[PDB]
């Protein structure tokens, strides 16, 4: 099953905001691949101020590095990934949504699909792809 | 001088009639004064807070279908996408 995860990672080091997002992406991707999964795409959304001063545990966050991960995997390890995300202090907010594959095997992320690129083949364009 | 609302501006290259230089034309014009209407899926716009924010009030209240003018299908998808954006930490 294709699952789109949208994580809101906290920024604590003002000099290298991307480090914590890198560590989180590494962890989630490692879990997905080591539990018979596939990581179709990692779209690096930028740094954005949160709509409100959202609170996780005791720390209060005003901005976050947003990031997206499209990955094909099973339901059980998907729930495991969600559980790990929820208890992790690094992830302010997390959300996993199914992307249906009933009709087309390959589908892009919500962002590219909204732009107009239905599939990842269109994302990487089509030359010598008729082989 | 003449307040702008009290003056009618004929655009360039447009035909006109003598009625156009009249207050009646201004009143008639006053009387008869995007992507989601283009066949797109609003649910796909759930991680896009700006385009969703186009369809809410200053306080964040979803606008009625009378205001948005969307179809019932796309109106429902827009409401669902806006609520999902609210839930996931965006918007």
């Amino acid at each position: 099953m294709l699952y789109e995860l949208i994580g809101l990672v906290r920024i604590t080091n003002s000099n290298a905001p991307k480090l914590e997002a890198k560590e989180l992406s590494s962890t989630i991707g490692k879990l997905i691949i080591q539990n018979r999964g596939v990581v179709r795409d990692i779209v690096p959304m930028g740094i954005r101020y949160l709509p409100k001063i959202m609170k996780k545990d005791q720390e209060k966050h005003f901005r976050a590095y947003h990031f997206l991960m499209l990955f094909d995997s099973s339901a059980a390890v998907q729930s495991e990934i969600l559980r790990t995300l929820k208890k992790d202090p690094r992830v302010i907010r997390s959300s996993i949504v199914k992307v249906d594959l009933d009709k087309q095997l390959d589908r892009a992320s919500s962002l590219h699909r909204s732009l107009g690129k239905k599939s990842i083949l269109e994302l990487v364009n089509e030359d010598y792809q008729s082989i | 001088k003449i307040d702008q609302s009290l003056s009618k501006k004929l655009p360039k290259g447009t035909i006109y009639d003598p009625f156009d230089f009249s207050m009646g034309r201004i009143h008639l014009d006053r009387k008869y004064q995007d992507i989601m209407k283009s066949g797109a899926n609003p649910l796909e716009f759930y991680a896009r807070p700006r385009i969703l924010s186009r369809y809410v009030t200053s306080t964040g209240r979803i606008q009625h279908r009378d205001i948005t003018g969307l179809s019932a299908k796309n109106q429902r998808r827009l409401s669902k996408a806006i609520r999902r954006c609210q839930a996931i930490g965006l918007m």
């Binding site: 590494s26 691949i33 990692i42 690096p44 959304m45 | -």
Partner: peptide, 22 residues
């Protein structure tokens, strides 16, 4: 794993074009 490290480094460590809405 190698492809994961490569892509992660590309997207984050490298200053690639990011999908940030203007």
């Amino acid at each position: 794993e190698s492809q994961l490290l490569k892509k992660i480094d590309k997207v984050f460590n490298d200053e690639t074009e990011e999908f940030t809405d203007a």
